[PDB]
C-alpha cells in the first residue's frame, strides 16, 4: 500500500489557511463556509497515505502531513462536538446512527480480545493435566501392579475392587522416603 501525494498536500495546507482556527471555526452557532469546513474536515477520515511511504520517504513530507492531519482532526472533532453533525455526506449530516469507529477498536477487538479468549481456552485445557488426576491414576496403577488378578475381573467389578484395595492398605510411599526417621 502506497498512497502519499506531496502535490495534494502542499495545496491542502493553503486550503486550510483560509479557515479560522478550529477553536473559533464554528462559534457562530455562512452555510457555504460551513460546507467547506464539512469537506475539509471530511478529509480526516479519507486516509491519505499507507505504509510504503511512511517507511520510505523523508521527514519534511512527514512533518507537513502531520501538521495537516493535526488541523484536520481539530476541525472534524470540533464540528462534530458543536454542531452534533458528522462531517460527511459533503455538508454536515446528522446521521450519527452507525459509521462511527474509534481508533482503538480494531486493536482491542481483533488482537486483545482474541488473545484473552485464547488464554481462557488454554487454561481450561491445561487444567486437565492437574496433579489430582495424575495421583488418582498413580494410586490405581500402584494397586493394579500389586494385585494384578483384579485385572481378570470384569470392568464393572474392577473399580469397586480397586477402591476396596485402596481402603484396606496404605499404598503411599511417604514413610519410605523418610529413611532417617527409623
Amino acid at each position: 500500500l502506497r498512497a502519499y501525494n506531496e502535490e495534494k498536500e502542499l495545496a491542502l495546507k493553503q486550503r486550510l489557511s483560509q479557515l479560522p482556527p478550529p477553536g473559533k471555526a464554528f462559534v457562530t452557532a455562512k452555510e457555504a463556509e460551513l460546507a467547506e469546513l464539512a469537506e475539509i474536515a471530511a478529509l480526516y477520515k479519507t486516509d491519505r497515505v499507507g505504509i510504503l511511504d511512511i517507511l520510505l520517504l523523508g521527514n519534511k513530507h512527514a512533518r507537513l502531513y502531520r501538521d495537516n492531519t493535526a488541523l484536520l482532526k481539530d476541525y472534524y472533532y470540533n464540528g462534530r462536538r458543536i454542531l452534533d453533525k458528522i462531517p460527511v455526506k459533503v455538508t454536515w449530516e446528522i446521521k450519527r446512527e452507525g459509521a462511527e469507529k474509534e481508533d482503538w477498536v480494531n486493536q482491542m477487538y481483533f488482537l486483545y480480545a482474541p488473545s484473552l479468549i485464547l488464554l481462557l481456552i488454554v487454561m481450561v485445557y491445561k487444567s486437565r493435566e492437574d496433579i489430582t488426576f495424575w495421583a488418582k491414576k498413580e494410586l490405581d496403577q500402584r494397586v493394579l501392579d500389586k494385585h494384578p488378578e483384579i485385572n481378570d475381573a470384569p470392568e464393572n467389578e474392577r473399580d469397586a475392587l480397586i477402591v476396596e484395595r485402596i481402603i484396606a492398605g496404605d499404598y503411599d510411599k511417604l514413610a519410605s522416603l523418610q529413611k532417617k526417621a527409623t
Binding site: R63, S115, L116, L119
Partner: protein, 481 residues
Amino acid sequence: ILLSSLYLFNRILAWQGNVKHFYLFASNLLLLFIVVLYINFNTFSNSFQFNFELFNSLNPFGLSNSDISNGLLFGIDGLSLTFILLTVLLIPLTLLGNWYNINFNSNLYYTLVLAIGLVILLNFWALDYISFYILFEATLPLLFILIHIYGSSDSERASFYVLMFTLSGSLFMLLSIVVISIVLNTTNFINHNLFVLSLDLQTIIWLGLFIAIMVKTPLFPIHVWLPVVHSESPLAGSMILAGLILKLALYAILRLLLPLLCEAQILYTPMIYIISLLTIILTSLATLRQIDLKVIIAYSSISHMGIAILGVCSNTSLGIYGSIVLGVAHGFVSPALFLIVGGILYDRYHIRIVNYYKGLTTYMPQLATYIIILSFANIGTPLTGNFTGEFLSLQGGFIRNPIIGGISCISVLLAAIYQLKLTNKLTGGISSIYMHRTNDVTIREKFIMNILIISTLIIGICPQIMYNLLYWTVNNYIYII
C-alpha cells in the same frame, strides 16, 4: 529486528505524532507472547523454565552461555507465571483508560505508563535478590514523575509520598539483602531454601524484609501514604498501583522470605497476625468517615491486602492458594472501581467530594449497574474470585490461629459496610442539584469494565482453573515436620 523495529517506531512517530497506538500494539503483542509461553510451559515440574542471564562478564550485552554466573538471573515458575498473566492483561487496559483525557504532553505520559508496566513485568521474572531489588526500586522515579506532572491538585505531596515511603522500606530490605549477600555469597532464588542460617541471624534478616513488606503492602500502621498517592494519581497510575504494585509485596513474601527464613517465620507469625488483624479492622473502620471517593476505594485495598497477608502467612496450602487468588481477583476488581471513580465520574465532573454525588441512576442507569456489580464483587459476593480468595485466606488463618482468624471473619461485615454505604448514596435518591447531566458510560469505559468483570466472574465460578499453575506452589512453602 531491534534495528528494524526501532525504525518502525521512529517513522510512526514522525508521521502520526502520537505514540499511543504503537504502545497499545506493543502491549497487545506482549500479552499474546505471554500466552504463547503459557502454551509451552510444563506444569508437571517445579523447576524454573524460560531462564536467561543478563550482563554476564563474558557477554555483557547478550545472553550468558558461560560456566560462571555473575550476571542477573531471570526465569519463571507457575507462581510467577500467574502474576505475569495478570500484568499483561492489565497493561493495555491502563493505556486504554486514558485514551482521551491526556492532551498536553501525552507522548511522555504514555511512555511513563508503559515503562512502569514493563518494569513490573520484568520484576516478576527476576530470579535473585539483586535483580528483584533493582526492578523493585526502578518504578519509584517513574511514578514520581508521572504523579508530579499529571496528577490532580495535591500531586506534589503525593509524588513525594510515593517516593519517600517506598524508599524508606526498601532501604531496610536492602540491609537484609546485603546481609544475605555477604553471609552466603549467593543471592539466587533457585537454591536458597538449601541454606539454613542460624536462628538468630534468621531472626535479624527477617526484620528488614518485613519492614519493606509492611510499607509496600501496606500494613498498619505505616499505610497512610496509600490513600494520598491513590487519590492524587492520574488514572493509569492508580490502576497500576492498586492492581499490580501492591501484589509485588505478596509475591515478595512467597519468593524472598518464606523459603529462606522458615524457622524465623514460624517464630514471627503471631506478630504478623497481630499486624494483619489491626490492618483489617482499623482501616475498615477508618474508611467509614472518608469524604473522597478515590480515598474510599484506596482504603478498601488495604483491608483486602490484610486478608491476603493472613492467608499467605498461615502455613497451609489453602491459605496460600487463597492469598494468590485474592491477589488476582483484587487486581481485576480494584482497577475497575478506580476506573469508575477517577476515570468516569472525575472526567465528567472533575471533583471527588462525596457530598456532590447523589442519585446517578436517573440519567446514567448503566453506570449505576456497573457500580452495583463492582461493589458486590468488592465485598466478596460468592461466584466472584474475591469471595474465593477471602474464604480460603480466612480458612488458613483460622487453622493457623483459631481466635485470630475467627475475629478476622468480621471483615465480611466491615467491608460490606463501607462499600455499600458509598454505593447506596451514589445510586439512590434524587439526581444531585450540584451537577448537570452528562453522558452515560462510553463504549471504551464499558469495554474496560466488561473485561475486568468477566475475569473476576470466570475465576469466581471455577477457581480450580488456576490450579494447574499453582499446585506445586501451595506445597513449596509450608513448614511442617
